[PDB]
Write a protein that binds this ligand. Structure first.
Ligand SMILES: O=C(O)[C@H]1C[C@H](O)CN1
Ligand SMILES: O=C(O)[C@H]1C[C@H](O)CN1
Lengths: 785, 785
């Protein structure tokens, strides 16, 4: 069904081999090699300007929208200034098991040399490493927590697109100028406001210059164009790129061209991801409505949305070799929000919502993450449509409950009107578009490794050493309640090592690594004259990535029913069994696995511990604030860390074997949800899903035959609405066969469009490692409920 | 009668040609050329270490103290990273008319030209240039004021030698380590403290490593040394440099080695000067007594004090070609304080004060400036000795009244015990040693130029632009009071412009240019974890250098006389008189010249205006605080700006002619004090000399025949004590023959040791330009009072 233009654009994205680009690396390295005493924030604006002035740019034949990250299709942009892993991990850059990257031409050496070696020891990531105390290094080694935003900028940019779409850069530039002219330096620290406004001005004029570069390219190409239809596309492009982003868009294409330009510019200034694109069906609606009444047909807009979506799919955010194994498929976590409600609470679904969903019906892209906002008065037509496409084309959208999200946000200090205008930076975490500086990556926390360390009263078998504290020798435990307290004591100590590292790191950013473009249109920054790292936003909070709950819940139900009720074994016998990885006593392993109930089967005796753990985690981290004064929130998600962190957790009492992967995110352990998906969501409702203010990341998988047709929607819609009626937040669907997934393993070339939801992002199954593929195939296939 | 060793050392300093050095310029430029995202304060510290690990060093055979700025005698260390003037003024650098410098090879181009080109547009001075508003540029151009600290660091450092000499660097390193260990980063700005302590550690361990380079070098020269006296010196030097500044010195020579290392380290980290050396006769006394008890003769200390004084006289602080002619001779303004009171108010003189004065009797060096602290209980021997030496030698103990300084410092928020430990950074401004961060260079202010603009109701005629405001039309002045109210409005306008620019600049240092070493032992910095620029000292205040006062006083007298009293002309006629430089009306200029009283002759009619003017400038600047929260204070001192600011002021009503030098500093104008030196100090008594906190700089010359014999060290007291009882602060004399200073121009190489006090600094007359020489020769010669 898709247009021929979109079929070629899609093909270029999906099939051009991704090549490492040296434009940015070369030009940034040359700018920072000019000695300077300019203040480092002004220097960084000026380095951004210099890079956008000299980098390569192309306009592909089929493109109606100007701009790519590179000067060729599928360029992979580099950040040797920020990323220290580009030194340690350099040799595997073009041999990865998750991220197919190639050099263009054995200018692998221009980068080995002239650049990565030149930066040795002086990258941002090298500064971040100096903030890690000696005791923390074993903690990081065995995977108790990770050191987030230590090789990326603070990322997670949420531009005020609702207002930017009406104003254009020149509005904010003039604001900074007006701010600058009435501002007095009375105190040394007042220079901060001067630097911030100036830097933001320099950077906004930089992007305008960048757009004018595409306009001139477009215009030269137009002069040599014989096809009248293309000649007109290019004169319209050149005209668009002289109008926008500097000025308000006049047309639907200009509005998309402004948002893309701004998105792209943010992507290139600093290493990082997770920037959102706002509520496209909302801020775009005046343009669709106007030009539609002018005669333009639905497909005019469809092709633009498709090119727009493909602009994002082409982007990369390369991470250290290790984050690329646990984040396989390279999530950008760049959301577009659809549906939800307006300020006054009435339905926000519109015609453009449907136009967009019908595009996804015809062509799905790995990114962006499409975030569909359910609410009680959601248009039923539109809701079921979104269900249709999640099952059919597969991949998107995930589904989100406005009533749960607005509760989280109000509990975080937002007003009702603000809460109604929420989106995501990251996997699933709610936030108020345009007015939040959400830190999605302080790091991850591994409750199960902490438990492992508690089962040995502070020593770690894996790396053999004392890294925790004495929470209590295991023989002294009278009850499940006694071991709960011993855990809470170990959890409290490690939660505080982690928050110390995270607070230190976010503070260091404030003295080394700005993000100017991402500040410009975050509400607060221009008004206060403070970039994001200097507390520019009115709202900061940090989500702790809690790597799973299922294994902890199950190993605690297993200890209660098998150690303290039925007394099948003391606890010293369990550590010996666990230490010895069940070598021999595999009869006993089956006792723990079958004789005690497992999470996700709507079994209150195991389900009671979900409430307990979410609560201790919330309580433990909430005795601190982050380095910008905001709360620490609970998020349950592992991405591929269930596998990678699992590799470092010995045998757990739930029956899980040493080094085997954990459950996936907040879902039950593989094989244990034997009672259908209404029971899985019923189990998650014992967490008190109004508590974790940055969400429970939930994966569900259905057999495509059983959820076929129109009654098949009714099954999915029921499972959904039942989740939401219990304050469920997020639900995420794969409608995929066990057999269909092995066919793509044996014959990847014939199944290069099966799109899987991994965690809070989607990826092409053939792009994923074989180890990660089998971990997605192990997921439970719900046959109904 | 001075030791052969001190004669040789003296010759090596006084006669080796200053040659521009490229170690710092080379090594620093090299370092800032390695790209780095490290924080710029940490980077500076590491830059500092790197330079100290690779600069050339050398040890003269006649030296017992290690360390020089260069690897040869009289090296001139360059600061291309800071000084913007190095580009625009490169060409004249080696053809200067009051500096006299030379390149060794064709390293003019070799390196130093190419190095400055590398830095082009990226020096600290370039960044400071951005802080000047458009409308301020004409004001700078015609010399209404000066952009202070725009090509230097905040400088003006004042180490806590009293404690340092007892603790060594290790004490402070360990205090940084302890504080770091306790410190939590709970807010982003808490990282400031981490960065401060770490940078101070790096910088102090760098100076220790540097000391070791000298130990290793001295040891090496010991073993090849065939003379057992010099061999023993070298082995002492080596043991010394393994001891200081890391640890508390144990000996007079070590205490001196420590002081010199610290001073020298500060001078090399960043451009600038005005660092004081403390009360040497005080903190050194325990070592002198213990070693004199042990049989060391006076001559042992006399030769260390001499070499130490020469170590400082060898130093350079190169300024731009403009400052290079208004500050002729390269003032370093590095004071050693002598005498004064102890904490309890008792006389602080001791044997070491005399030993020190005896050295100056025998050998005077241009720097350090020596400030003798007089007070009502001062030892009569010591005081009269100090006078003798000021007379029979390049006058160096200038004289300062403790009662007047302790009054200034009390009005500045200091305690009585604090104010007794006072010294100078700058020319004459009082501060509390170890506990003050005094800005001696916010910039100068030209009240006479402001007066010009007032006479033209806001216009500057030379440039024809209305750079000021509407003071009022001169044709409307009913009274001398009307003119005074007019000048006040103009003064307020330009004073606010000046303060705006100085405040912005001092803010600028706090985001670009640290002074780490000078922060280390400033009380407050290590305690608070703040370098000086981040408000580390408990006391910051800023002296506005007011370019003279005499011409203003005389002009207002001349106007009250000839315009308003005896109606010789009207205000419009006076203006035309002035706009034409008195052309064809020399009768009239003689009227204003002689029919109206002048300043410095104890005539109340004119002297009443000195109170009004000093009050107006104080009141006007007290509307504001500096950027660190401290007050602005008045410093009446022209330096040699009376020539270079003179050239931008038209004829004035006191009879001075367009382009003509102003009166020098806080003195009366050439020719006007005709009634003796005792009357000049009575005239300055109508200033109310308790009001200019930071002092009026007073120059007085005497005919050598008159004040000879003991009826000089009896008649000298005379004019001294009567200045002090009248609350006089500063009384600094030069006793040159006037016929001696003319013969010393025809035979330069024959009067190479003639040292004149030229505006709070002191220099050898055969090192000044002719224009600055013939102007120093127009100072009133007093034949007695
Ligand atoms: O690493 C990141 O980008 C964030 C994404 C997710 O919200 C949790 N960690
Ligand atoms: O320019 C300077 O270095 C200071 C010195 C003295 O206080 C007058 N101004």
């Amino acid at each position: 069904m898709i247009s021929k233009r979109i079929a070629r654009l899609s093909d270029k994205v999906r099939n051009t081999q991704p090549t490492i680009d040296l434009d940015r690396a070369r030009l940034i390295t040359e700018f920072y090699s000019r000695p300077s005493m300019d203040n480092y924030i002004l220097r960084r604006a000026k380095a951004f300007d210099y890079y956008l002035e000299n980098r390569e740019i192309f306009i592909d034949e089929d493109s109606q929208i100007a701009g790519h990250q590179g000067g060729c299709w599928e360029a992979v942009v580099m950040h040797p200034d920020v990323t220290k892993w580009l030194y340690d991990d350099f040799d595997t850059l073009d041999k990865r098991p998750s991220d197919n990257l190639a050099f263009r031409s054995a200018a692998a050496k221009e980068e080995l040399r002239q650049i990565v070696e030149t930066w040795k020891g002086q990258t941002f990531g090298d500064f971040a490493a100096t903030l890690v105390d000696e005791d923390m290094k074993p903690m990081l080694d065995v995977g108790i927590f990770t050191h987030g935003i230590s090789n990326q900028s603070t990322m997670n940019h949420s531009p005020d697109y609702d207002n930017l779409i009406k104003r254009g850069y020149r509005y904010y530039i003039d604001e900074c100028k007006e701010k600058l002219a009435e501002h007095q330096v009375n105190d040394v620290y007042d220079m901060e406001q001067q630097i911030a406004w100036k830097a933001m001005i320099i950077a906004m004029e930089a992007v305008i210059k960048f757009a004018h570069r595409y306009a001139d390219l477009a215009n030269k190409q137009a002069a040599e164009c014989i096809d009248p239809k293309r000649k007109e596309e290019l004169l319209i492009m050149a005209e668009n790129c002289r109008t926008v982003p500097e000025n308000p868009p006049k047309t639907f294409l200009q509005a998309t061209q402004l948002v893309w330009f701004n998105h792209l510019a943010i992507s290139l200034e600093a290493a990082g991801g997770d920037h959102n694109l706002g509520r496209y069906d909302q801020y775009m609606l005046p343009f669709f409505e106007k030009e539609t009444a002018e005669g333009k047909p639905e497909e005019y807009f469809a092709d633009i949305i498709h090119e727009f979506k493909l602009k994002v799919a082409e982007m990369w955010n390369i991470r250290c070799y290790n984050e690329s194994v646990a984040d396989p498929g390279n999530p950008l976590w760049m959301h577009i929000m659809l549906a939800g409600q307006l300020e006054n609470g009435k339905d926000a679904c519109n015609e453009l919502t449907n136009v967009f969903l019908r595009c996804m019906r015809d062509l799905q892209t790995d990114e962006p993450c499409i975030t569909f906002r359910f609410h009680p008065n959601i248009n039923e037509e539109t809701f079921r449509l979104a269900i249709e496409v999640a099952r059919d084309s597969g991949g998107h959208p995930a589904f989100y409950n406005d009533t749960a999200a607005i509760t989280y946000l109000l509990s975080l200090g937002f007003t009702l009107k603000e809460a109604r205008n929420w989106g995501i930076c990251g996997c699933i975490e709610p936030q108020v578009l345009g007015k939040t500086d959400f830190q999605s990556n302080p790091g991850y926390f591994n409750p199960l490794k902490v438990f492992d360390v508690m089962l040995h009263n502070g020593y770690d078998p894996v790396i053999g050493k004392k890294i925790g504290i004495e929470s209590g020798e295991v023989s002294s435990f009278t009850s499940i309640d006694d071991v709960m307290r011993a855990y809470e004591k170990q959890l409290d100590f490690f939660m505080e090592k982690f928050v110390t590292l995270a607070n230190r790191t976010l503070a260091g950013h404030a003295f080394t690594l700005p993000t100017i473009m991402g500040s410009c249109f975050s509400v607060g920054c221009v008004e206060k004259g403070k970039l994001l790292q200097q507390k520019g936003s009115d709202h900061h909070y940090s989500a702790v990535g809690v790597a799973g709950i299922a294994n902890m819940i199950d190993s605690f139900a297993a200890m209660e029913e098998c150690v303290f009720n039925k007394n099948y074994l003391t606890m010293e016998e369990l550590v010996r069994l666990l230490d010895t990885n069940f070598e021999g006593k595999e009869n006993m392993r089956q006792l723990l696995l079958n004789k005690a109930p497992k999470f996700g089967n709507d079994i209150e005796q195991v389900d009671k511990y979900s409430y307990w753990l979410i609560d201790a985690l919330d309580t433990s981290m909430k005795r601190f604030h982050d380095a910008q004064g905001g709360p620490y929130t609970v998020l349950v998600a592992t991405q591929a860390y269930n596998v990678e962190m699992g590799k470092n957790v010995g045998a757990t009492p739930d029956g899980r074997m040493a080094g085997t992967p954990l459950a996936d995110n907040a879902s039950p352990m593989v094989g244990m949800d034997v009672n259908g998906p209404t029971a899985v969501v019923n189990s998650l409702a014992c967490c008190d899903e109004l508590v974790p203010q940055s969400g429970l990341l939930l994966n569900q998988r259905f057999d495509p035959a059983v959820v076929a047709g129109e009654k098949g929607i009714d099954i999915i819609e029921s499972v959904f609405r039942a989740h939401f009626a219990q304050n469920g937040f997020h639900i995420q669907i794969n409608v995929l066969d066990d057999e269909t997934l092995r066919a793509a393993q044996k014959n990847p070339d014939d199944h290069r469009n099966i799109l899987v939801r991994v965690a809070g992002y989607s990826a092409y199954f053939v792009d994923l490692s074989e180890e990660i593929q089998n971990n997605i195939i192990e997921r439970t296939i719900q046959r109904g409920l």
